[PDB]
Amino acid sequence: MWPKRLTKAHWFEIQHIQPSPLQCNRAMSGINNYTQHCKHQNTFLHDSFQNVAAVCDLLSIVCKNRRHNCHQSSKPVNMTDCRLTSGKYPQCRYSAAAQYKFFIVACDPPQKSDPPYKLVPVHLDSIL
Questions:
Q1: How far apart are alpha carbons 30 and 38 in whole angstroms?
Q2: Which terminus in the chain has less CB density within 10 A, N or C?
């Protein structure tokens, strides 16, 4: 069981960080349990937290929400798109689609219980 309240950065890691590609149904089951529903879509980045957090140090750009705390990867990375195809919670089933794309993350200063980087990733703003 993941604990009661996760930081935004910790939830980002749980939700979007998976360096070796796995089975969509397996990978989503934990996330779905914590949210108590079948998430309709999720993108897993096949890269390490360390590598993704490093993107936070790159040039800041505008996010979809018009904030300026977003950062684009310097290279594309392997990722998988999981899309809900059937089932009612907790029986959620997915199809997988591999991608090789740049990504943009939103970054914030760490909270106290976060790893003490200058910035940590907290949202997957977009893939491009």
A1: 10
A2: N
- CATH fold, domain 1-128, is P-30 Protein (3.10.130)
Q: Which residues are catalytic?
A: 16, 123
Q: Which tokens belong to 32?
A: 């779905």
Residue numbering of the annotated binding site for substrate: 39-43, 64, 83
Query: For residue 9, which amino acid is it?
Result: A
Q: Where does 1-128 have alpha helices with state H?
A: 8-16, 24-35, 49-53
Q: How was this structure determined?
A: X-ray
Distance, in Å, from the CA atom of 78 to the CA atom of 53, rounded to the nearest integer, reads 16
Q: Which segments are annotated as binding site?
A: 39-43, 64, 83
